[PDB]
Write a protein that binds this ligand. Sequence first.
Ligand SMILES: Nc1ncnc2c1ncn2[C@@H]1O[C@H](COP(=O)(O)OP(=O)(O)OP(=O)(O)OP(=O)(O)OP(=O)(O)OC[C@H]2O[C@@H](n3cnc4c(N)ncnc43)[C@H](O)[C@@H]2O)[C@@H](O)[C@H]1O
Ligand SMILES: Nc1ncnc2c1ncn2[C@@H]1O[C@H](COP(=O)(O)OP(=O)(O)OP(=O)(O)OP(=O)(O)OP(=O)(O)OC[C@H]2O[C@@H](n3cnc4c(N)ncnc43)[C@H](O)[C@@H]2O)[C@@H](O)[C@H]1O
Ligand SMILES: Nc1ncnc2c1ncn2[C@@H]1O[C@H](COP(=O)(O)OP(=O)(O)OP(=O)(O)OP(=O)(O)OP(=O)(O)OC[C@H]2O[C@@H](n3cnc4c(N)ncnc43)[C@H](O)[C@@H]2O)[C@@H](O)[C@H]1O
Lengths: 191, 191, 191
Amino acid sequence: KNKVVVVTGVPGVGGTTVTQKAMDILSEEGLNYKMVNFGSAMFDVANEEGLASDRDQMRKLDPETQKRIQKMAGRKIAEMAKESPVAVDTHSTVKTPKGYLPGLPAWVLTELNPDIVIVVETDGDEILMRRLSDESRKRDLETTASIEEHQFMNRAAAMSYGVLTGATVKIVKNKNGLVDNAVEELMSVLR
Amino acid sequence: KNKVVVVTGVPGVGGTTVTQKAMDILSEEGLNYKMVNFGSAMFDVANEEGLASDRDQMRKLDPETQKRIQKMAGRKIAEMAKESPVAVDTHSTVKTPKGYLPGLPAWVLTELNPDIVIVVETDGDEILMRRLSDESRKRDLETTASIEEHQFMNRAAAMSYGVLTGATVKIVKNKNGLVDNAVEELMSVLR
Amino acid sequence: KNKVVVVTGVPGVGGTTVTQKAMDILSEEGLNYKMVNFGSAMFDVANEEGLASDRDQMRKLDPETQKRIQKMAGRKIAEMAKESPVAVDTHSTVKTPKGYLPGLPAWVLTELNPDIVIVVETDGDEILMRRLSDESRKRDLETTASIEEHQFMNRAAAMSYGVLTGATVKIVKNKNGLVDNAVEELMSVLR
Ligand SMILES: Nc1ncnc2c1ncn2[C@@H]1O[C@H](COP(=O)(O)OP(=O)(O)OP(=O)(O)OP(=O)(O)OP(=O)(O)OC[C@H]2O[C@@H](n3cnc4c(N)ncnc43)[C@H](O)[C@@H]2O)[C@@H](O)[C@H]1O
Ligand SMILES: Nc1ncnc2c1ncn2[C@@H]1O[C@H](COP(=O)(O)OP(=O)(O)OP(=O)(O)OP(=O)(O)OP(=O)(O)OC[C@H]2O[C@@H](n3cnc4c(N)ncnc43)[C@H](O)[C@@H]2O)[C@@H](O)[C@H]1O
Ligand SMILES: Nc1ncnc2c1ncn2[C@@H]1O[C@H](COP(=O)(O)OP(=O)(O)OP(=O)(O)OP(=O)(O)OP(=O)(O)OC[C@H]2O[C@@H](n3cnc4c(N)ncnc43)[C@H](O)[C@@H]2O)[C@@H](O)[C@H]1O
């Protein structure tokens, strides 16, 4: 009976790093989590079917386009749970033109059946500051207000995921320099 | 079924207007939706049963089966949608005296399944102020701390709806004097 | 219809005394709702098994063991509600090292089928003093910010519950020295 952890965040919050750096310290101790990336789940199956041209042209497609390739990673990742403790790096909601789209709607929530959901946070100002220094990608650097509104809906969604699955919801805080503090807490929650 | 859109917001925030005005402009575009005030769609159930008269003793009505009424109206709109894209002017939660009442309960929610939920928001001060100008209704005059509260719990409903039904949650701001901007927001989300 | 009322408030807020007082008055005027305390109930399930020596340290167990016990207690009360209306005393979310474990997952909400979910609230300054002036316990005395984060997620928990069960979500304030505003406002919705 293995453990599925969901690590959610707004872009540029550092969900991924904190996760990766968390499993590495764990690997050496005994606990070999997976590093699935729920977004890339659907991008191994996307250029493969001609909907994007990279990993930043997927949330500029229509609602009916993404919501097919979702319920598929849903059990495809669930499969991987019949092998090892998973850590599904995903998004509580998704910023799109149509509005906040749930990153794990009920049908994906049953398929995955999480034991813990985690909402990595920080200020919009710090998030924004981080979005700029990351040469590795393109960030909206939108206003603080939109960050907070997102981070607000991310909580109400995270909590519903906990209601529906019984998953406990952890809120990790991740400050500049203090990223070590987010790992270790993601660790006490992972162990 | 088809494309179904639910448009919500506390009394006074002007969600009804934003909806009519959009579908006025939409009707001249050769695409045709459907105004439906969930409120009166369920008034037809009222007198046909003689349970209360007013459209007031229905959030103030005997709480057994306020839900009965609520239930039926929600699947009546159901078929109203296979036929045409629908737009449902309603509320996320209804501030009855037993607390907030979820406009779209689990059942009605499934019995409808919108592809979009829309949350219309503005300051308590302005909401309050529009209520003074709504002479069309026998309005109440509540505090702002409590308007803000209700808009809180609304967003939460609204997001629990999204998850349960894969629908996108859009928060559309509708400030004083700027009716048309929210109209443009509603619309480009309907397309 | 037999009436299941749920009442929640972070530890320290006064959910218990609120419901206590609310019933004396009700019991000395006809309806004694059954006074039932979710944690008292499930403690009795744990001590008997040895998993807990004190009621206090059950939330420091593992989530999954907490959910087990929790589920047994949810169905102990379910049979309690076949034969008398029950104001059940519980929590929107429990605070654990692994985050906010819900207080009524979907399967538990199904069990009780509450009609009203009530949230008791107040400032985290006021609560922190209630926690110090309470001999009957051994409180851990946490940060203000951590109380509002819990009281936040509580609201989204308790809102989730409304959308699933169709219960009404009543929010109720218990300030210092004003213990009897809560009692009376509870009854007013309790009867
Ligand atoms: N389940 C779902 N359903 C439907 N669609 C889904 C979905 N899940 C994903 N998608 C789709 O997938 C696409 C991809 O998502 P998108 O958000 O665009 O990229 P991502 O794969 O999800 O990664 P992030 O954007 O979240 O970057 P990150 O900050 O979280 O991680 P990291 O810390 O390593 O990023 C680098 C950051 O590290 C942080 N960092 C690095 N060094 C430091 C430091 N020294 N101090 C503090 N922070 C640091 C910085 O903030 C830096 O920016 C989206 O279009 C989305 O629509
Ligand atoms: N889901 C469901 N379940 C259970 N019950 C349900 C239900 N759905 C509905 N009901 C029931 O239906 C009943 C009421 O019907 P319903 O119409 O659904 O709710 P309501 O309380 O009566 O809503 P209002 O008409 O008062 O507010 P509004 O913002 O929609 O009105 P308007 O667009 O005119 O805006 C207000 C005024 O401000 C003006 N205004 C001024 N400036 C602006 C501007 N800047 N933008 C927009 N409007 C402006 C507008 O012109 C207008 O005059 C309730 O009892 C409720 O129980
Ligand atoms: N659904 C679920 N799922 C999984 N686990 C669950 C669960 N539900 C419960 N649990 C578990 O069960 C346990 C729950 O224990 P629980 O039953 O919840 O604790 P308790 O013994 O009742 O006391 P609390 O710590 O809960 O404080 P309270 O404020 O709620 O009650 P009170 O008003 O009397 O506090 C009284 C004190 O506050 C003060 N006070 C009250 N009102 C006022 C007033 N207005 N002015 C001044 N002081 C006041 C007085 O000083 C008094 O001393 C947890 O460990 C958890 O594991």
